[PDB]
Amino acid sequence: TRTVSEGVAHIHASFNNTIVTITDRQGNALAWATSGGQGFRGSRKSTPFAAQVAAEVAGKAALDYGLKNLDVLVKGPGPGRESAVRALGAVGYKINSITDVTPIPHNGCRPPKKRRV
Amino acid sequence: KREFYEKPTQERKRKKAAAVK
Amino acid sequence: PRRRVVAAREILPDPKFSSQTIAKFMNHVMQDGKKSIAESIVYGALERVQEKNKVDPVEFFETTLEKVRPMVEVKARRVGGATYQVPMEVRPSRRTALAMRWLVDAAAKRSEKTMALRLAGELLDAAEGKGAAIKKREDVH
RNA sequence: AGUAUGGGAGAGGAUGGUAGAAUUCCAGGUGUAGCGGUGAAAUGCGUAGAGAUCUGGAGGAAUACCGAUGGCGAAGGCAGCCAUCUGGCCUAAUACUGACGCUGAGGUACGAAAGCAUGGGGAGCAAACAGGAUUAGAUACCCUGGUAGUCCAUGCCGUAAACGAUGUCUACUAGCCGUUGGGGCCUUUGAGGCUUUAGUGGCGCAGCUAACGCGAUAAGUAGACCGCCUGGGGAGUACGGUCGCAAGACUAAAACUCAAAUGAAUUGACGGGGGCCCGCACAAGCGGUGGAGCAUGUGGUUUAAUUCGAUGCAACGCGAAGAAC
Ligand SMILES: [Mg+2]
Ligand SMILES: [Mg+2]
Ligand SMILES: [Mg+2]
Ligand SMILES: [Mg+2]
Ligand SMILES: [Mg+2]
Ligand SMILES: [Mg+2]
Ligand SMILES: [Mg+2]
């Protein structure tokens, strides 16, 4: 395998779904996992319970590269944002730095209207 | 996130009035 | 209750051995207010166990009971539609109650001539490490 | 009331240049089975290679924190940074002209958004439109796409809950607590403290008011001038007239009909409005029903009749503590 052993983590967080992606510092992807692969298929994906499952599945996939140095970067609000951290701590990975990399727009485009119902 | 074109004036003023007391 | 806490009920010890644990075990075995048949079952099981190895019955009973006792149990706590299985600590009374219940029903599942004989057999099997009562107790799950 | 001198603050206005973040698109690296979306789903996207991440470009709009009880402007309104031009305001007293002032029917200027005309631009959002859900029905709220429009330059339109629902100017009339721009005094001994102006806020005496409330920023006490009202609907409507490319804008009745329409406050009731408390109501334990056979009551169907009542909890082993005559 690659045996780079320095793959960082990209835990994308959303209200509807949970996206997990682990890649090297350069950005060439190694492995990824989401709630949809596990078979939830609906609002159950929005629940935080599938987030740690997808994260630990991505960790099992990363076991092939034998990587154990992590940098966690999260984007977006919603439940399941922190469950991936507990997952990657339970599997036994070492994490170098922990921070939020959510993007804030500086006077971006006009957002959509508010939902009345 | 959403659009509020001028209603932040209302919300800021009322939150201020609450914070005064 | 919502306003006041209720104290636990006091159980008189058994007449033969003056042990409260044996009394609670007989109360757990008893059904439909038939205390006499449960007493006969428990006493026959105790005597049959004592005759195999001449040991004072109450101490052996306590030692074989504590070995099958659990310490933690799972709570169903729904948060956002997920099960959220979680371990909980509970006081020794709740744990010894479940221990007695598991011992009783595992003894009932056995096939023997009478209830006393199968109870003594399950007691010996759980004491030596091959019974089904100890298999019922799963801490990892 | 105004002029000259020396200082201060400010998203006041017009023109030009320039910067970052974020969204979309165009390729490229690795990787690739679901992604998107909902109270639940589906329309939609993807093995051509989805979604996530990294690197380089293109274009459009707005300036995250600072931001505030701010500030400026006659009002509408004005917020990234820099340059040019320009208006008003505050502040110290020295000199100056000596009533040169207030208001103002007609008139004139400015005037949110939407809309209209000409020529460009178009990232995101999104009238009209299409598709999928829910509903007895959905024409709408919900979701997926999306054209005018939102942007720029030159013009038109002149309407808003254009509100402080309070016309402009002047003088007087208890206090307490904050803030913005200046000046003076005390020990600038230290961002300190005390007084004088010009703005902007919160209570409150007298007084006013039907009440709510206003109360030196009056809705108090007085003066100058203008506009506007005379029960509700018809109706800001018809006709006429002026303006406008159009949409329409302004001025503005009557016939008829009713005996009411209204403002503030009080007591109940209700709320798919908010908090606190209690109950074998939830939590724990034991034993049942729902499945089988039979007894009994009810609903339906049949018959000549299957006598009549009781009908969510609070009717159904109920009237009936007992129909072979
Ligand atoms: Mg005038
Ligand atoms: Mg006039
Ligand atoms: Mg008007
Ligand atoms: Mg008016
Ligand atoms: Mg007052
Ligand atoms: Mg008209
Ligand atoms: Mg009856």
Side-chain angles (χ1 to χ4, degrees):
Chain A
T1 61
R2 183 169 179 191
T3 72
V4 62
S5 180
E6 320 299 315
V8 308
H10 285 262
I11 177 54
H12 176 85
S14 177
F15 277 92
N16 295 143
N17 196 220
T18 60
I19 305 302
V20 183
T21 293
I22 43 187
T23 182
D24 64 332
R25 309 183 191 268
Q26 283 69 22
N28 297 39
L30 277 304
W32 60 269
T34 177
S35 172
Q38 296 299 110
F40 287 75
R41 200 213 69 92
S43 66
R44 283 81 51 198
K45 308 185 300 183
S46 67
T47 61
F49 162 69
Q52 73 265 36
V53 176
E56 66 183 2
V57 162
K60 299 292 178 68
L63 291 175
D64 300 66
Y65 306 105
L67 57 93
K68 280 306 222 206
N69 302 118
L70 295 193
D71 287 330
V72 290
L73 301 163
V74 67
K75 300 177 65 184
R81 185 175 64 245
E82 194 270 309
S83 181
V85 173
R86 189 82 54 81
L88 299 176
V91 185
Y93 280 71
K94 190 266 286 183
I95 298 91
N96 196 42
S97 65
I98 297 93
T99 187
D100 188 359
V101 72
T102 182
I104 185 67
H106 294 345
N107 313 275
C109 293
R110 181 151 182 172
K113 82 183 77 61
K114 182 176 174 65
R115 311 165 72 258
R116 285 193 285 276
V117 165
Chain B
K1 54 181 73 174
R2 296 294 180 185
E3 185 65 27
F4 277 119
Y5 183 78
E6 205 198 78
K7 271 67 182 173
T9 73
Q10 293 181 357
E11 73 180 2
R12 288 182 153 199
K13 185 68 176 177
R14 201 180 69 171
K15 293 178 182 178
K16 183 272 297 182
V20 163
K21 44 203 301 296
Chain C
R2 182 173 291 168
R3 186 183 293 274
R4 73 281 188 192
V5 187
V6 183
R9 190 164 283 102
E10 162 188 336
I11 294 173
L12 264 63
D14 52 348
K16 196 165 187 175
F17 301 107
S18 178
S19 200
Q20 202 162 313
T21 299
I22 304 295
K24 197 142 199 59
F25 191 57
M26 295 190 320
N27 290 13
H28 275 300
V29 173
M30 178 187 59
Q31 300 180 186
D32 294 335
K34 312 171 78 68
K35 182 172 282 292
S36 54
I37 65 176
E39 284 171 341
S40 68
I41 287 170
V42 174
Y43 288 152
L46 284 186
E47 185 277 348
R48 187 62 202 276
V49 170
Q50 175 182 348
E51 289 294 328
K52 187 174 182 181
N53 43 0
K54 274 73 69 178
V55 177
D56 165 64
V58 295
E59 185 176 1
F60 174 89
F61 183 84
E62 182 66 27
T63 59
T64 189
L65 183 74
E66 189 271 358
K67 284 185 290 185
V68 78
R69 286 182 184 175
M71 71 289 290
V72 287
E73 189 61 27
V74 181
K75 290 285 290 180
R77 60 178 181 89
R78 301 290 182 270
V79 178
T83 49
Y84 273 71
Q85 62 90 34
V86 72
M88 267 289 146
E89 67 197 8
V90 293
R91 60 184 178 270
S93 297
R94 166 81 173 176
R95 305 175 308 129
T96 188
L98 274 69
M100 291 180 178
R101 290 281 84 198
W102 303 346
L103 183 63
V104 166
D105 71 1
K109 291 187 287 292
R110 282 168 53 98
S111 70
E112 281 282 331
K113 278 291 156 290
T114 61
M115 182 64 183
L117 298 185
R118 72 195 71 175
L119 179 56
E122 178 82 350
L123 273 175
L124 300 170
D125 289 10
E128 73 192 19
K130 187 60 69 177
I134 58 162
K135 181 62 70 176
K136 210 272 190 187
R137 170 193 168 186
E138 306 274 21
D139 62 337
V140 297
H141 309 295

